[PDB]
Amino acid sequence: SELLVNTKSGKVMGTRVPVLSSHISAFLGIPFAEPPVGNMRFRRPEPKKPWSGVWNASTYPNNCQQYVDEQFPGFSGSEMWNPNREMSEDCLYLNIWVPSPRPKSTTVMVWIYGGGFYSGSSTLDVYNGKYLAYTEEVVLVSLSYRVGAFGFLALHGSQEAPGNVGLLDQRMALQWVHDNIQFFGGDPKTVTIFGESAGGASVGMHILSPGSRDLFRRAILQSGSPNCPWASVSVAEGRRRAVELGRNLNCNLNSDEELIHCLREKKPQELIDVEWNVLPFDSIFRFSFVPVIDGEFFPTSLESMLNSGNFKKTQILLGVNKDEGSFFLLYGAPGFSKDSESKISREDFMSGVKLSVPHANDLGLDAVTLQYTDWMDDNNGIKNRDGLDDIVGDHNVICPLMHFVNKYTKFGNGTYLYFFNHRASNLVWPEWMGVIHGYEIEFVFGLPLVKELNYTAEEEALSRRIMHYWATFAKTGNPNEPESKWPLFTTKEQKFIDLNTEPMKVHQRLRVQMCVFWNQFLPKLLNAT
Amino acid sequence: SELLVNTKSGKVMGTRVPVLSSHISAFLGIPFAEPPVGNMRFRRPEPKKPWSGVWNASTYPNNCQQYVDEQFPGFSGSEMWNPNREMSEDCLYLNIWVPSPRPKSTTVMVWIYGGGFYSGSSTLDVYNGKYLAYTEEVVLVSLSYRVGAFGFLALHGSQEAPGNVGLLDQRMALQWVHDNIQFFGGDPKTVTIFGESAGGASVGMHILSPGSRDLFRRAILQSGSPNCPWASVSVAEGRRRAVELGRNLNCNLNSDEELIHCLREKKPQELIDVEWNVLPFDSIFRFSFVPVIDGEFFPTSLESMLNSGNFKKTQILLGVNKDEGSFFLLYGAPGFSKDSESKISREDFMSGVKLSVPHANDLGLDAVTLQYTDWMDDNNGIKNRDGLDDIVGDHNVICPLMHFVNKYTKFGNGTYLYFFNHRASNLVWPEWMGVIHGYEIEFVFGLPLVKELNYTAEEEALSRRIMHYWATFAKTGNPNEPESKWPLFTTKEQKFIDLNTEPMKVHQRLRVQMCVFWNQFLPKLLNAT
Numbered sequence A, B: 001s002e003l004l005v006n007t008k009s010g011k012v013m014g015t016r017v018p019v020l021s022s023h024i025s026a027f028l029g030i031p032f033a034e035p036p037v038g039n040m041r042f043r044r045p046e047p048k049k050p051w052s053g054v055w056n057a058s059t060y061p062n063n064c065q066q067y068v069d070e071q072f073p074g075f076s077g078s079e080m081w082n083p084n085r086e087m088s089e090d091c092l093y094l095n096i097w098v099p100s101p102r103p104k105s106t107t108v109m110v111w112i113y114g115g116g117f118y119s120g121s122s123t124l125d126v127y128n129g130k131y132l133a134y135t136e137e138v139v140l141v142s143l144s145y146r147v148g149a150f151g152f153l154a155l156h157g158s159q160e161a162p163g164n165v166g167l168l169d170q171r172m173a174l175q176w177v178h179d180n181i182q183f184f185g186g187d188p189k190t191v192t193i194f195g196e197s198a199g200g201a202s203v204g205m206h207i208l209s210p211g212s213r214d215l216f217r218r219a220i221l222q223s224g225s226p227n228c229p230w231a232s233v234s235v236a237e238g239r240r241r242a243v244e245l246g247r248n249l250n251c252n253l254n255s256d257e258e259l260i261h262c263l264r265e266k267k268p269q270e271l272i273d274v275e276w277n278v279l280p281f282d283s284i285f286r287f288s289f290v291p292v293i294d295g296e297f298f299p300t301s302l303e304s305m306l307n308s309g310n311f312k313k314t315q316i317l318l319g320v321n322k323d324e325g326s327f328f329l330l331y332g333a334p335g336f337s338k339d340s341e342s343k344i345s346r347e348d349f350m351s352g353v354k355l356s357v358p359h360a361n362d363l364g365l366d367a368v369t370l371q372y373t374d375w376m377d378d379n380n381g382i383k384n385r386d387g388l389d390d391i392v393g394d395h396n397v398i399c400p401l402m403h404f405v406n407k408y409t410k411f412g413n414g415t416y417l418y419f420f421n422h423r424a425s426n427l428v429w430p431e432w433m434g435v436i437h438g439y440e441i442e443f444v445f446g447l448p449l450v451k452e453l454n455y456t457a458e459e460e461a462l463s464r465r466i467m468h469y470w471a472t473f474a475k476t477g478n479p480n481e482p483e484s485k486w487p488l489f490t491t492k493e494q495k496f497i498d499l500n501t502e503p504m505k506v507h508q509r510l511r512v513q514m515c516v517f518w519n520q521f522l523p524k525l526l527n528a529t
């Protein structure tokens, strides 16, 4: 039967799912690791022990334990991102959408979700892979990995909580795909990993880490880079946050063994309740438990790895959205509100700058403020709001990604850069937020093709165009069909294209003026002072 | 006789001079101090001893000893600024143009020339006061003062070469005007001092210095402010440069007395020959012997004086030209030439930045470079050239002046700001230089009214308009006739007007973006690092 697949770990039974007046196969909730529960919490993952009989893969699995966004109860804009399945530490499963009839050896795409390493679910409606798998004839896989303390508590030197285990979960899923995707009709030698936000940083981290490189062929990074200021911490900071977490739960802090034991006896929600109390600074776009530069998963600092060309050399396709920063200003910066135009006063602007660049001294803050202020109209509420939006987006997403693309392109085999600037016609978030962080995902996964979702014909066309770009790239290493051509990004010309409902346009040096400030000047200033 | 005036110092005989098909009286070469020759070199000036008989004031006096510009022999563009009379240390004289018939008590304007405190002559063709005196019915006076080492060698603590003596020469001339202008038909209670470049800085210095304040009523500053980075040095730097000058002339440096004695035995040209060798840095728009913050002429630092409102409170009219920096880049920056378009490479740009901000460390240089570079087109020769032009103009003239105007306006009785951006149709300097430092002078002095000079009718109209603005301001403290109105500059609105052949336009916050960088950010950065 088409819904029955025998893998190296055992047999799995899928289910037929309808999609755009047709059907395909779906194998949901396939385990790729032993449940990281009990004495295994914080530990590196273990491969799932093979099973006898048939594994029922007809329904979505549980979501990992995580902070749940309750800032706007009942509001779909924020709740569509929250876990939509019961949460549980027993959450290491993957999902696969397979075209019908089953392919023999087709292109494979593996999705990595990414809410700042503290949130994410492979089961969100916006991650339904049936549309992409069906439309582009690719085997679509979505994995999962532990987030929050569960996946990133780091007490370097300890083997019980070494850190980066959430990344290792991802790696184990990729290993499983590499070993078994052939049985689902996928070609294990043509696997493209792609993710957004922390998922985008994750993709880049697998490109960097020696132990992950051989597990995939190509990569796509959306609004996220491995070198993002929020994507990793030093072994020392990781340890500090781990100890501080223990302090919040009245744990014995005499030894790593004492701390870990205590943390393992706590219920999942107890860790989540105090998770945010360990951040070192009052800030936005900063998360508590994230990957650590340990000398193992990451041999050396990310910058020296990028500079020496110490990473997987292949083709990459990546880009950013127009207003990456708006979402984070809304959730934490004074003056912003979901139901107002959020015009910002000169004072809230300064408070925003402080929250946006927590690690900066006064001179650094002045440099930022000067760089983003229109001194011929410094009290313009809209300009202050948009200025902060750009500050947060440039610092946390765009400029770190541009640094990565320029460093990578020097050794890579092909780079394609995009700038997504289309605001969906059916967004429920206010207009001032613009093209929000994470909102290119629905186009990548083809939601606009679903009539009931109220997208415009132009948006459906955009989705199809993006899906075909992503799938063609995954298949050939070039988004262009062998129409206007998406030029290759080169060190010299640095071309990129815009992704919107208007006729494609090619541009050059994406926000270069600002990124030179964030990538070259500010770091030098903070280091000299 | 109309050409005979009895002053408190003796009788003087003037001469009738033709002007625009008419005539007026001119009393040229009137001495206001004892010749600062011999043992008086470097000393404070002494009042001229009264004389018996009639002083022949029919011809221009000698010009003070100074460096002579030979960068373009035979070229009028540069030579029209060189001394046009024999040079001599016996140069402390003033010139007066009086309307005919002689007024009884009319508005007085005193011009102060200013080539970086190292050059200047009251006899230049562009300083002919007959046009302004005649056209506006004002008594026009042009004074003189020692420049170079002769007027500013400073060995603080010594009474033989205390420094600032060139400023004291100016003061003595103003004292003479205050005491005797009534006999020429001028009203000593309505004297406006005005000057350009170092002359503009001088005007501001008389506004600041307690001992000069009571000698005039109003002030006009053109392309120069007292706080300019090149307008003054500390007592320590002044001493260092004085000693270094002695070192260049093989002087005994055991004591101030030894050094001064040696310097006084040297011929004037010997000091001038090595004058430029004492600068501390390789730089442009920096001069060797300039005013010193001595605690006497200047009670305290200029900034604390400006901040505490410790200065003469009256009305001021001041402004700048569009391309203040071009002239200095041409004479000293790599890549610039008088006969080429001077497109600058990225490397010469960096060399230019270094020469423009000599006192800055590498971080400071990077900040400047970043601020003036268009990173979407960093190798554009014209943009690099224009960028350097702006850097030099903003740092040395415009931003220091804007800082002065904002500090002054807080305590002053009325401020009028202008931005001169008309390039004369008959300039012989290349087009890339634009509206050059010092080129608004010919319009202020009315040269365009002279047909033989080949100006356009529109330029004649502009000159008349400017002359009437200057004279009406000198007379009433308001440039506007009791036509489009020149708005008052206020701390709040910060309005100013443009001066060109096009219909007057009012603007706000003159180059505020750049000046915040130069006046607030860069100083803070250099101080923190």
Ligand SMILES: *[C@@H]1O[C@H](CO)[C@@H](O[C@H]2O[C@H](CO)[C@@H](O)[C@H](O)[C@H]2NC(C)=O)[C@H](O)[C@H]1NC(C)=O
Pocket: A412, A413, A414, A415
């Ligand atoms: C990506 O790598 C390929 C192969 O390493 C580059 O193309 C090569 O194609 C052949 C090998 O398969 C060689 O014979 C060619 O010489 C080589 N291409 C050239 C002209 O050097 C390809 O250029 C790389 N693409 C990018 C964008 O770097």
Ligand SMILES: C/C=C1\[C@@H]2C=C(C)C[C@@]1(N)c1ccc(=O)[nH]c1C2
Pocket: A081, A082, A113, A114, A115, A116, A119, A120, A121, A124, A196, A197, A198, A327, A437, A438
């Ligand atoms: C940085 C946090 C994110 C990102 C964007 C949004 C809108 C919500 C978020 N919590 C989230 C939640 C779940 C998820 O899968 N991705 C993301 C990406």
Ligand SMILES: C/C=C1\[C@@H]2C=C(C)C[C@@]1(N)c1ccc(=O)[nH]c1C2
Pocket: B081, B082, B113, B114, B115, B116, B119, B120, B121, B124, B196, B197, B198, B327, B437, B438
């Ligand atoms: C800073 C030096 C200057 C200024 C502008 C020019 C063009 C020449 C200059 N040497 C000069 C020479 C004589 C003079 O009277 N003024 C000036 C003003």
Ligand SMILES: *[C@@H]1O[C@H](CO)[C@@H](O)[C@H](O)[C@H]1NC(C)=O
Pocket: A056, A058, A059
């Ligand atoms: C598991 O499979 C059975 C059929 O064997 C069926 O009830 C359903 O698809 C799954 N059970 C659940 C989770 O309801």
Ligand SMILES: *[C@@H]1O[C@H](CO)[C@@H](O)[C@H](O)[C@H]1NC(C)=O
Pocket: A452, A453, A454
């Ligand atoms: C489409 O529009 C209807 C009615 O306006 C609305 O109720 C519905 O929520 C929209 N579609 C979606 C995304 O549910």
Ligand SMILES: *[C@@H]1O[C@H](CO)[C@@H](O)[C@H](O)[C@H]1NC(C)=O
Pocket: B056, B058, B059
């Ligand atoms: C000085 O005055 C005399 C007349 O007394 C006359 O020769 C001329 O105006 C002046 N002399 C000079 C400098 O030629």
Ligand SMILES: *[C@@H]1O[C@H](CO)[C@@H](O)[C@H](O)[C@H]1NC(C)=O
Pocket: B452, B453, B454
């Ligand atoms: C006016 O033009 C003539 C002829 O073109 C030129 O020789 C002269 O120099 C100009 N006028 C001046 C400033 O001398």
